Amino acid sequence: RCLRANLLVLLTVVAVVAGVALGLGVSGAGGALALGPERLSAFVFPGELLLRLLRMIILPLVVCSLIGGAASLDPGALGRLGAWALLFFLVTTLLASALGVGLALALQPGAASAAINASVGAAGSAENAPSKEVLDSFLDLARNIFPSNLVSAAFRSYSTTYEERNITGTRVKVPVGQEVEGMNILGLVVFAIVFGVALRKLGPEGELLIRFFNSFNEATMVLVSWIMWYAPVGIMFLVAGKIVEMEDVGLLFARLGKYILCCLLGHAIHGLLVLPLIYFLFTRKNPYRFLWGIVTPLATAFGTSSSSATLPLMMKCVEENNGVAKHISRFILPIGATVNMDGAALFQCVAAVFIAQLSQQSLDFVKIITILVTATASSVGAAGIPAGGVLTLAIILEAVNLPVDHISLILAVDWLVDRSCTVLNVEGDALGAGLLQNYVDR
Amino acid sequence: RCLRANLLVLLTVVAVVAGVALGLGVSGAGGALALGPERLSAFVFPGELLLRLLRMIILPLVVCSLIGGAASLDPGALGRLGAWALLFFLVTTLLASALGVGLALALQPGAASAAINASVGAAGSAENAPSKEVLDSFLDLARNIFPSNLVSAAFRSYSTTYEERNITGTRVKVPVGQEVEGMNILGLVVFAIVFGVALRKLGPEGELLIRFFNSFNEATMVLVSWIMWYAPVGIMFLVAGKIVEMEDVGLLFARLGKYILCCLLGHAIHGLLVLPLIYFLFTRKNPYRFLWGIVTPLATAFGTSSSSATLPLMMKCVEENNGVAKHISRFILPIGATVNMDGAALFQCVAAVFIAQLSQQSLDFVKIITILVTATASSVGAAGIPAGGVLTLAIILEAVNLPVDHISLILAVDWLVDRSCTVLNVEGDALGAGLLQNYVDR
Amino acid sequence: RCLRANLLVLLTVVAVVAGVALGLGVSGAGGALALGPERLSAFVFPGELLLRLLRMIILPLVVCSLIGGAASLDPGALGRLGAWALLFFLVTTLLASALGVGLALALQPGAASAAINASVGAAGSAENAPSKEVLDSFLDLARNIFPSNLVSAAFRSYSTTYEERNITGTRVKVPVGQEVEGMNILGLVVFAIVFGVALRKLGPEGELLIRFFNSFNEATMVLVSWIMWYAPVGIMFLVAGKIVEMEDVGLLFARLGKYILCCLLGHAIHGLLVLPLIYFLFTRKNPYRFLWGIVTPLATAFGTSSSSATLPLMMKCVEENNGVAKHISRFILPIGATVNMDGAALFQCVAAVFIAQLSQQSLDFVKIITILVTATASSVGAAGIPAGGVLTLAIILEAVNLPVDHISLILAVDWLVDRSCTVLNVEGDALGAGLLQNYVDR
Ligand SMILES: O=C(O[C@H]1CN[C@@H](C(=O)O)C1)c1ccc(-c2ccccc2)cc1
Ligand SMILES: O=C(O[C@H]1CN[C@@H](C(=O)O)C1)c1ccc(-c2ccccc2)cc1
Ligand SMILES: O=C(O[C@H]1CN[C@@H](C(=O)O)C1)c1ccc(-c2ccccc2)cc1
Structure with a gap:
């Protein structure tokens, strides 16, 4: 049933295109001058609503899916699968970064041009920042892993701010920890995997709890279907709002065309040559066919600019x-x-x-x-x-x-x-x- | 068994009356002068304790009751029931507001009297306020619906404050969102209803989870029984504290007697003529008998001044x-x-x-x-x-x-x-x- | 199997001893001068990681254990057991305090010595404090009991700060309540016990939910095993860090030797004479054998300085x-x-x-x-x-x-x-x- 199967893909592509057209037409016809901030908020609000819907369910879906997936195969095979997965992710990220070097070195987007000027962009505020150390970032990573509290980790993460508690002499900024806002999805992932391994370590005692979590995830997937059917409207309004929020006639493109072309070309080459080549090499199955199988989450990722939010739609698809x-x-x-x-x-x-x-x-x-x-x-x-x-x-x-x-x-x-x-x-x-x-x- | 059945109703009515008597006697005998703020806190504290008990369980009871109720009838009948319920609530609220207009227009509580003076009440602080826009209020409503996170929604809600980020010229207050304290009970209600519909969409996978939530709500109801048996003491001390916190010999009643009489008469006419008339018209069963069936939650509502807090007692009764x-x-x-x-x-x-x-x-x-x-x-x-x-x-x-x-x-x-x-x-x-x-x- | 059974006890005792040796050697060899705050943070970080791991699971373990334990015996026997337990705890705490009086009165640690000076320690900052009243502390205790919200109680507790809202005359600090950080473990304990009693009050409706919570606690215990196997490294690094954070060649021991000896002697006499005597008197079984059965949680308590954090290891052991x-x-x-x-x-x-x-x-x-x-x-x-x-x-x-x-x-x-x-x-x-x-x- 091609007509019914491909309706969603057609709808989200049309949503992105029509959102671009709507935003460009509004910006050309006056934009903010004809809109006002209140109508801007109402115009972007479907986008915010879609992102509120998709951030509501990533916690249930991630936690219960990992608990239902980890405890479906024995810990030996799980350890091998996790290790080969981390190796794959590491290699793909490294290849992406090397591709970025190879492109930016060749095309030379930092040639002498309008982008040489930076007074308007910086204006002295660039240097002023928290300036988080690399060690402190890694420590906050390993403290968001292994959270202090699971409930707080459902909406808070550890960020090491820097105070000036060295008044005794030679004032040096010292770290202090204070939990801030943002999900600790890494900590929940690790806790959930470890939990599922514990339930597989148990036997009949855990069958109830696995049945609970699988049922819970299936219910959340049923919610995801309806969120998916809503998603094109949110994508359209979000894209229109995010090109109405700044003029895009071509001024910033004319400023940074080489850099943006380098980034988009790197992304396409990574997404259309490297990883499809790896898939064909290993599984020997049509990678571009598979890529067409997932167009709706990809379009949602483009519209949303959030990997975690598109994930329920992706796992469904x-x-x-x-x-x-x-x-x-x-x-x-x-x-x-x-x-x-x-x-x-x-x-x-x-x-x-x-x-x-x-x-x-x-x-x-x-x-x-x-x-x-x-x-x-x-x-x-x-x-x-x-x-x-x-x-x-x-x-x-x-x-x-x-x-x-x-x-x-x-x-x-x-x-x-x-x-x-x-x-x-x-x-x-x-x-x-x-x-x-x-x-x-x- | 009338003697045992009506004990609770007798006890809470006696609690309200004795709390009024206790507070009036304390205020007449010296009140705060004989009490002090520390003993005022200890005197009000049973009221705060009852409200802490009843706010502890509205989250379990609401969430699990809606999940256990939505997934008891098919989504077609659920949609019809929800629509006729919203229509009923809308019509009753509208009739209440029209009754308010009809009373305040006739009795004319804003006639020339002591209430004409407002310097003592306002003193310039009335105008100073957040001054939330209507559009921003509706947007915060539709963002508390569809929450960003469920856990945060269990104790936080979205409130759009207003900053002054328009220093470029003609300083206009702009909205910013920052989550504040207070339950997002509307968002939890919507999520719970949607969840129960998802479980009814599933079949055998959801029977476990429905059994879980029904058992959980029944346990919470068993807690509600004991909270109910405690409630008269809390109501008595709360009412006594809230008439000791301000003198009520009749000064403010002598100031705003017409307005308060208008409000109480409107409430009684809505609660004793309009809605009983609607009940008799539709179901043809003694509405005043039914009203007597629920006196304890009504007295608890009068004592508490909180609709959500009285709800567990109401659903039990x-x-x-x-x-x-x-x-x-x-x-x-x-x-x-x-x-x-x-x-x-x-x-x-x-x-x-x-x-x-x-x-x-x-x-x-x-x-x-x-x-x-x-x-x-x-x-x-x-x-x-x-x-x-x-x-x-x-x-x-x-x-x-x-x-x-x-x-x-x-x-x-x-x-x-x-x-x-x-x-x-x-x-x-x-x-x-x-x-x-x-x-x-x- | 003595060799495998006693490996953990050997490992944690060796961890404490080696951590003491490592910290003393580092402090003598230069300490902070050779370390720096960044390496101090990395050196203490395994300790913080162990405390983050053990604070992650006390909420699941406490809540689900109390729900699975309260609903295993009828409420009459539960009430008797709880009453005799509270009586035992009260008597043991009282005996401990009396032992403290008897020791400090005899040894007289407040004799004339270096400890007479306090300008360096206080420097005027001692008097400046919140100065919480005893009544307000008891009210905050009884408000952390019976929490307002369970989710917030999973990481927040009620603390009554004091504002100056008495500008009318004779400025007196007045209490205000604002929830602060820290688990409300007492409130969760009471709610969990009450819940388990409710499930025992129910019959077949609660069997599912008891099976859920027992399975959940067993999974958390399985996590506790692995946390236990990690624990010696955390204890070693934590102890080393906490004696590197201040010099302990003997200056503060030479200052407060009588007071510290009084406290340690009181603790040992309470832990090695009084309570073993009570155990032998009542159950007539080797109390010191039993004390050796739990050395790993005791060493973890010494290393961590946190009773709640050592509790999962204790309940496992x-x-x-x-x-x-x-x-x-x-x-x-x-x-x-x-x-x-x-x-x-x-x-x-x-x-x-x-x-x-x-x-x-x-x-x-x-x-x-x-x-x-x-x-x-x-x-x-x-x-x-x-x-x-x-x-x-x-x-x-x-x-x-x-x-x-x-x-x-x-x-x-x-x-x-x-x-x-x-x-x-x-x-x-x-x-x-x-x-x-x-x-x-x-
Ligand atoms: O750290 C991230 O990744 C960055 C690198 N690529 C970008 C991406 O694709 O997300 C961003 C990130 C992830 C997720 C969200 C997020 C946004 C809205 C709602 C909920 C969540 C933000 C930032
Ligand atoms: O918005 C509300 O309604 C207003 C219009 N009528 C009044 C009412 O009857 O509640 C108030 C509201 C609801 C509930 C609470 C509440 C209070 C204590 C503890 C927990 C919750 C407050 C305010
Ligand atoms: O109030 C307490 O007890 C005091 C009297 N004796 C001391 C003890 O043994 O804990 C402290 C307390 C309990 C637990 C924590 C705690 C620490 C780290 C992580 C998580 C929790 C702190 C303070």
Whole structure:
């Protein structure tokens, strides 16, 4: 039934296109001048509503799916599957970062152009920042792993601010911990996996609880169906709002065309050559067919700019349409969302290479390897914190000591490049799931 | 067994009467002068303890009751029942507001009297307020519906504060969202209903989870029995404390006797003529008998001044004493608590008409319809936020542009009129439940 | 199998000893000068990680264990068991406080010595404090009992701050309530016990839910096994960090040797004479054998300085190694953690007697009884709040009006005496559990 099967894909693609058209027409016809902030809020509000709906269920779906997936195969096979999955995610993120270096080095987006100016963008506010240390970031990562409280971890994460409690002499900023807002999805993932392993360690005592969590996840999936049918309206209004919030006639594109083209080309090459090649090599099945199987979550990722929020739609589509195993999907895809960020590592490395290319920095071999490794680690470093969309580049440049004086340049265009990132991240998650499904099948 | 059956009703009526007597005697004998703030806190503390007990269980009871009630009848009948229930609540709230207009217009409580003075009450602090817009209130309503996180929604709700982030020129206050304290009971209600529909959409997978939630609610009901047996002491001490906290020899009654009489008469006429007439018309069963069946929750509502807190006692009494169906009770009465506020719409409209009557405003037909509709919507607008006992009148007067210069007059007497409101709200909920029980039975 | 059975006890004792050796060697070899704050954080971080792991599971384990234990015996036997348990805890805490008086009165640690000076310790900051009233502390105790919301009670507790809302004349600080951080484990304990009683009041409806909670606790116990195998590393690094954080060559020991010896001797006499004597008297079974059965939780208590955090390890060890009944363990030991603080009452009373001994206060009989009773109540008073490690001594001295001018003396050495306190508290809990197991068996 092609007509009914492909209705959703048609609807979300039409939603994205019509949202772009609506926003461009509104901005050309007057935009904010004809709109006002109140009508801007009402115009963006369906987008915020879709993101509120999809952030409501990631906690149930992630927790109960991992508990229902971990306790479906014995811990030996689970350990092997988790290890090969982490290896796959690490390799894909590393390949993405290397592709970013190879593109930004060649196209040279940091050539002398309008982007050389940065007074308007920075205006002295770029240097002023928390300036989180790399060690403190890794410690906050390993403290969001192994949370102090599960309930608080359902909406809070650990962030190490810096006070000035060294009045005795030579004032040095000292760390203090204070829980902030944002889900600790990594901690919940680890707790859930460990829980499911514990239930598999038990036998008849755990059958009730596995049945509970599987039923709960199936109910949440039934909610996901209806959220999916709502999603095109939210995507349309969200995209229209996010191109009405700033003019996009071509001024910022004319400013940063090489950088944005480098990022989008890197994302497409990662998402249409590298990972499809890996899938074909390993499972020997049509990767582009599979990519068409998941267009609706990809479009939702482009519209939402949030990997965790698109995940319920993705797990529904992957388990339903494509012939991916239910337990493998449950175990892999949430872990893919919180660890695999191919696009994030890609455009972080490309941004670093761009800001280094302007001012003519060297970056011969050692610094290249450094940016690769720290991008690969920051793939998960940025994952626990939702606020740090591109904030993690500052700590990278602190590690390797580059000019952070114009990091605010990307914040004007973060809302565009970070969407293709989300597309590629969920794509890499699904491809890892398919590969590991075939590996477990063999 | 009349002697044992009616013991609780006797006990709570005696508790209210003895609390009034105790508070009046203490205030006459010296009150605070003989008491001190520390003994005032210890004297009110049983009231705070009862409210802490009854706010502990509304989350379990509401969530699990709606999940156990929604998934007891098919979604078609559920949709019809929900639609006729919302229609009933809307009509009753609208009739209440019209009754408020009809009374305040006739009795004319805003005649020239001591209430004309407002310097002592306002003293310039009335105008200073957040001044929340109507659109922003509706957006916060629809964002507390569809919460971002369920756990946070168990004790937090979305409130749009206003910052001054327009330093570029012509400083205009802009909205920012920051979650504040207070349960998001509307969001939990909607999520729970949707969940129960999902479990009914499933079949054998959901039987475990329905059995879980029904067992959990029955346990919470067993707690409610013991809280009910404690409740008269809390009501007595609470009422005594809340008339010791301000002198009530008759000064404020002598000031606002017409307004308070208008509100109480409107509440009694709504609760003893209109809704009993509707019940008799539809189900043809003794409505006043049924009203006597629920005296203990009504007295608890008068003592507590909180509709959500009396709800566990109400659902216990309605399912136990009166022959109302268990599933219909579960589905309707929580929704009645968070949506139906007949008394709130009533005294909000009466307060508006009173402040308009002083200063001799017109309010011919269009403004009357405006106050009716905005009161009907604010019935649920005030429901998500517990702090806004009468705060929502300011946004109404912002919509229709009346003198808010003396809104602080009612805050001295909010603690009295708002209790009969709670009585009428729970009464309207129970009457809707009885009507819809008979409709489903037919 | 002695070699495998005793491996854990050997490992944690070796961990404590090696941590002491590591910290002393690091402090002697340069300590902070060779370390820096960043490496100090990385060196302490395994300790923080162990405490984050053990605070993650006390909520599941406590809640589900009490629900699974309360609903294993009928409410009559439960009421008797709870009453005799509270009587036992009260008597043991009182005996501990009397032992503290008897030791501090005899050894006279407040003799004229270096400890007479307090300018360096206090420096005027001792008097400045919230100065919480005793009545307000008891009210906050009874409001953390019977929480307003269960979810918030999973990570928040009620603390009555004091504002200055008496500008009308004679500015007097007035209480305001605002929820702060810290688990409301007492409120969750009471709610859980009451819930389990409700499920036992029900019959077949509750079997599912009891099976759920028992399965959930068994899963959490399976997590506890692995946390236990990790624990020695955390204890070693934590102890090393907490003796590197301050020099302990003997300066503070040379300052307060009599006071610390009094506290440790009181703890050992309570833990090795009084309670073993009671156990032998009642159950007639080798108490020192039983004490050896639980060395790993005792060492964890010494390392962690947290009674609640060691509790999962304790309940695992008591149910596994020693022949204590599962249901009795579940019901008693969590209640022991939140109520029984023998060591806390002990060193609080000893600290009071020490600060009274300096400056030559009388403390004849009435004040002795007062310190005993308020210490016995503050055993649970300090339990709800985790921040108040020794903060509760100030409110005691407010009750009985002693010099609080040098309360900051103990804060330098709170990290040492408060560890043996934790050891004795968990010891008293386990001994009460064994006694009541034998009583129920008889
Ligand atoms: O850390 C993240 O990733 C960054 C790198 N790529 C971008 C992406 O694709 O998300 C962002 C992140 C994840 C999720 C959310 C999120 C947003 C709305 C609602 C709920 C959650 C934000 C930030
Ligand atoms: O918004 C509400 O309604 C207003 C209009 N009528 C009044 C009523 O009857 O409650 C108030 C509201 C509901 C519930 C609480 C509440 C109070 C204590 C504890 C827990 C909850 C407060 C305010
Ligand atoms: O109030 C308490 O007791 C005091 C008297 N003796 C001391 C003890 O043995 O704990 C402290 C308390 C309990 C538990 C924690 C706690 C610490 C870390 C992580 C989680 C929790 C703190 C303070």
